[PDB]
Design an enzyme around this catalytic site. Structure first.
Site, PDB file in Angstrom:
ATOM      1  N   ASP A 254       0.818  -1.197   0.000  1.00  0.00           N
ATOM      2  CA  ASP A 254       0.000   0.000   0.000  1.00  0.00           C
ATOM      3  C   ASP A 254       0.861   1.261   0.000  1.00  0.00           C
ATOM      4  O   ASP A 254       0.353   2.372   0.134  1.00  0.00           O
ATOM      5  CB  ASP A 254      -0.907  -0.001   1.232  1.00  0.00           C
TER       6      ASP A 254
ATOM      7  N   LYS B 196      -0.138  -5.272  13.442  1.00  0.00           N
ATOM      8  CA  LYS B 196       1.115  -5.005  12.724  1.00  0.00           C
ATOM      9  C   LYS B 196       1.893  -3.912  13.461  1.00  0.00           C
ATOM     10  O   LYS B 196       1.340  -2.871  13.812  1.00  0.00           O
ATOM     11  CB  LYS B 196       0.795  -4.533  11.305  1.00  0.00           C
TER      12      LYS B 196
ATOM     13  N   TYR C  77       1.433   2.189  15.225  1.00  0.00           N
ATOM     14  CA  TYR C  77       2.791   2.717  15.358  1.00  0.00           C
ATOM     15  C   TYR C  77       2.856   3.971  16.215  1.00  0.00           C
ATOM     16  O   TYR C  77       1.989   4.840  16.135  1.00  0.00           O
ATOM     17  CB  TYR C  77       3.390   3.077  13.997  1.00  0.00           C
TER      18      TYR C  77
END
EC number: 2.2.1.10
Lengths: 264, 264, 265, 264, 266, 264, 264
Positions: free
Chosen positions: G32, G177, G146
């Site tokens: 992506d 992730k 993140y």
């Protein structure tokens, strides 16, 4: 577990409020007869009846929203309606929504399908549709399936009852209420042919207690997941005692001899 | 409090505008006959009628939205419609919504169900459904339940009327309107078998002021929570007086002799 | 003021476009017959009829959305449909919505209920429901109430007509269209029994302008708030003139003699 | 009548429950301060305050839904919220819907717009939008309009207040609550410049009862349709009496002297 | 009616005919939405009167906020925009009324105000574009008041800015555009020519002399304006009925300033 | 009765699953810290803590939907989210819906509002709005109200905390979670100023168990309806024991010296 | 089984199309990056990269709907968008709906939340909301969490990463992730602190293969449920080979030593 296959957190949580943890069986006392037959014996002072059945050890009571709105156990809200006064007494329509039952704190809802009645296919759709609503809301659904209609002489016929129960499971019901077929063997076929746990109805008030309790005892033998009797409990002289009797047979497997000792 | 069990702020607030605080009974004068029978005697100049009755002390008038849109008591908006001119005079359909009644400032809504009429199960659903809308909006619902149909000879039969009233309560009505069964004992059964307060209808205009007032007196004796008479009030020579008479009997518990004196 | 009870700004505004301010009466020329009977005499060149009746002084024309979409005076959009070719010619269903009529600039909508017809209760619900839509949108609603069905021999019966009109008012109609009952007295009962102003239909084309105009004159006498005639106007030899004649009887309370004079010999 | 222009059946019906039929004036006791300033003096035991106020003759109390949900007069549900603890104390957001107020049986709703505050245009939209919701539901809307913000030194300035009140009427409010401008003449300008009836706020608790009652008397003189005082009533030693003083002034146009006699 | 021969919307055509004079194909709109912006100013205190007078003088339509209509035969235009001078951002305009509300009130048209150049004016661009679609669906004619106003605009009457502003209104869907006169016939003719939708001029603040004002309207008509939408210069005048009649003479009958003045009494 | 004023069948039913029937008090162990502070001590093996705590006698656990989706007491689903890592750690947004909590079988939902934080008015709206959703669904709502922001030095200030709690009740919360103000008297003011029952937070882990248990003891004294402590329970060496200790104080109304005994 | 706890038939079915049955681990190749950084090396001929990666034996590719609309492995549709050219490169908004991904036949969807970025709370809400949509549709959700923002110097800080991963699980993500923290011990803390299986990102292209494969090997050691590397795979000279290498380490517990033997 009895519902090891049910992949629905909501349903598991609520089902635990209507099933006995140790026995994994249930004693449901349906009292929705008011709609069908009017204020019959035992359902005139519903506040007392619900209370006794509860004190007797019943896991849950099954009522129409109207009665709950007026008068410690599991609550199952009935969604079907039809009366004996109607030109088509076997017709059942949805009178209550799953959402209404949820906002009332109900632990489950129930629907009644007279398989074999006029335009019964309309109820097939109602069941299938409501099943989806129940699945979304995590509301366990009890489907009372009965073979009733113009071409059905024996509503207790083993083949018809097994079919009716199967129908309920296929369309999405989590639990199925149906009539006992008369003998342990044929009823075991109903139970085996239905992927969902089956619960037996009490039928009209029996003459002798031993009669009724033996029927429940046989049904459990055939593999029933419990019972859902109305008349035979609330129309009894000792509601609390007869309920206690039923709980013995269903949760403890006590024989009719010990059971009867409960009837005061 | 009659509705001590009603856990709905909206309904409690509105119900207080149609029930006498002291007596906790109600005198409702339904005037929805226009739809059913056309402009009958007493309902031609509805504007006058409403005021005379208001004077006489009726707690509330029951009308169709169209009449309110035109002509100090409480307001109940009727939601059902059907006419004598219809090929099926017993058929009732929903002609007004609860929401419409609410935006009109109504204090309650009413529905009429002819239990026993053709496709009466459709009205069972309407009642059950509307009951939920009323519950959501905090709108008290009055259900006029009557046993009427091809197989009902005596629409005043105690069993049928008690069943009909029960039906209304089970499906969610807050108050039930029904016919007097003819005698205090059988009607007391209707009242006892119905969890919701019951109010009696007046029936067609009686021959004498005593006949009628005695009937109301008996109904109150049987346990009625009030009355909802139309014809016997607005078709009377002295509307204000006959209303006053009814209030005497209903709110102050006067006897017929003391009440009749209010008529001129 | 005729609608001094109507507590609806939208309806008041629109109603003023179909009622004569001075007479507080209305001359409506309904031309929705196409749906019911096909292209009958007078409604073949609808564009001409409208303009013809408009010049004659009609307050409003009543049409189905399809005709408006094609080819001053007020516009009333009909919402009901049914045909003589149907196995049930008395059946009426909703074919147009109030919203559609509103976005077309209509000043009002009309519904037709054959009280006494098969499953007429379904129309009772339609009326009641549409009445609420109309109330919300500020759209005046004209309900054409007629006693018609298997058990009705005389669709002009005073009792049945009065009941039918009452029904319309009770369920929410602002104005009621109905048949004249044949005589001033019985029709006055219809008017008195109906809380909403009543307007008379013209019925099939009469043999004489004296009969037709006399009927309208009588209806006004009985208390009608105006008229809603179709056939007797657009099926006439002098549409403009006959319309003018009707306006004299309705708006200027003239007599049949003085009125007939408006027709082109 | 005062609401002869209001072409809304629902609003007329409800407005009559908050305005005195004879004087065509209203005494509203707003008690929504809890949200703005916490449990201040007089609003700690809200159940009692509401009791005394009603007792003292007030026409209606104005509360947030949460307080109604807990503990005979009219009811106005406030829809706006903001606190003094907020980094932007003048900010008001919609915390309750008109629909919620309707299902609670409220007779009216109120919104608060601080014209001149940061992003006050957002409240302009809220008012205008809510105004439409109120129009649809037949719910009378009271708009508390105040000139408050970084560039406003005198929140009682006649021009600013008149503008603020006008804004409320223009956007759809049925009634406007605003500050008294200090003198009969300038306040008469506020009243004349606002198409909707204007009601005055009480402001913070005054030192003498005459300081307060005189202000109300002057406001009525200027043409106010009534009053909506909170602190000056519920923070008084004799809540019932002071209320009762205010009513005598507002409903009977008594003077401050006869009014003060109502205080103990 | 040649003015809107391109409008393929039955509803709009029907309604537009109630605000435009059939013969002159021009319009005299008297906007009275100032209450919201500036409070109860001179001439708008007794709105019921101003509305009646203006109608008596012959205006084609009045433009009001829903609240004022709600409080007791000219066309009616309901304003949808709101903002006030008291606001920390006086140039901000938000939607305060819906097209649907205007429709259920019997209004013949709705109006929106966009201050092109104001803070977050792009939010109004969206409101206009969106409301334009609602109007198209409902057959409700939309009048877009487009003005160049903001921190970096010194001359809100600048010909380029005004022409751009008017164009914006037409591009986004407005049926009619209200804007300021640019000061001279030539530059304003550019505004009219650059805007596909008919343009109507605003009156601006009350002028000292009836001539300044009437001459301005006369010039605007010359430049090609489809009519006028003046508020203050009409309702703040000593003879509201007369000044309105004066304006109608200019716009509807192309009478000249001297003849128009014959209508103002005193 | 604590919830005698609650006219909502659904809420009553569910509230009974988080409050001890005899003492009408509650011990809630909130474990939503994961979202705010990451996997802190005691919340790493959430499955264990939930049972550890359940064992000790707590009435309910409070979690985010994600944690429930994985690992016998009442369940409260938290609806608010915000983290310490965020450029605005005091910001809270709605991360879960009431409907989601309902279909999960939750008995209640909770929201967190930092009164005084940036754009806290947005949370005022969230609370008010969610309160209505909860009212409709019969879902009891717990509002954690705290005075936190750039201008608040003492988040335990009696005035600020009382205001914050009041705000929660006013806007519709059924129960309020807030910080103890440090002393019995000031906290009693918080309790008295808030119409809804108040529950105290535990705050960060204390040095000694006496300080912690004494604080809870004092809070109960001030009139708290129970407690909602997280860190002080799951970050303790003997989770089961400390929970048992807390239950003794709240449910048995024991004293510190005796409660400190349960600590194994 | 990894999702022994996932009580969602739809998710289980779909998850099996992205996880290796025998290893219960996954190798996801996210592509992506186009949206974030434009057509970078390796993602210019996406049709080739997807197929190359497919032949290498990757379990699934993660793309934006636009790329799929052009071009046997599992498909994960990304829902977040933001670019490096934006005045706020860390901002992520929802650019694709779960429904769109479903009608495209996707086996899962992914969202990206930069915890610590400006208005990151808006992404907290998006995650929580989308999580519910995913739960309803039976669509497994992968949350890329993140720690990134103005006050975060080390986006690989063990505490911040563990918190970020926990946030994802708490709010409803099925899989998380995140970045490897640099060492087996600290990353094991991330894995242990997050109730949902964690998958590591590849980070920017490493200078040596031994550098990258060792990192993956360490992450698996720490307890990762697999990997989700983009750049280190598609920007490699031998895409198929490096993918094969990763599958060896991840799917077969192979050594870096043994793995590199796959790179031709």
């Amino acid at each position: 577990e009895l519902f090891k296959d049910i992949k629905n957190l909501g349903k598991l949580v609520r089902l635990e409020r209507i099933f006995n943890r140790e026995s994994e069986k249930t004693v449901i006392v349906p009292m929705d007869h008011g709609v069908s037959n009017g204020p019959i014996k035992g359902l005139i002072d519903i506040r007392k009846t619900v209370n006794d059945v509860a004190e007797g050890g019943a896991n849950a009571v099954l009522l129409h929203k109207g009665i709950v709105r007026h008068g410690d156990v599991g609550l199952i809200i009935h969604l079907s309606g039809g009366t004996a006064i109607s030109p088509n007494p076997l017709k059942k329509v949805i009178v209550t929504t799953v959402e209404e039952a949820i906002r009332m704190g109900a632990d489950a809802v129930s629907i009644h399908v007279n398989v074999g009645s006029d335009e019964d296919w309309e109820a097939y759709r109602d069941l299938g549709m409501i099943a989806e609503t129940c699945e979304y809301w995590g509301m366990p659904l009890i489907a009372m399936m009965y073979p009733r209609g113009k071409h059905i002489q024996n509503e207790r016929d083993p083949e018809l009852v097994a079919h009716a129960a199967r129908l309920g499971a296929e369309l999405g019901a989590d639990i199925v209420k149906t009539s006992y077929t008369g003998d342990i063997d044929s009823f075991r076929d109903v139970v085996k042919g239905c992927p969902a746990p089956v619960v037996v109805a009490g039928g009209p008030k029996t003459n002798t207690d031993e009669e009724f309790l033996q029927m429940i005892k046989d049904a459990m033998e055939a593999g029933a997941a419990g019972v859902a009797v109305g008349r035979n409990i609330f129309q009894h002289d000792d509601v609390v005692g007869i309920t206690r009797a039923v709980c013995k047979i269903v949760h403890e497997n006590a024989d009719v001899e010990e059971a009867l000792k409960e009837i005061r």
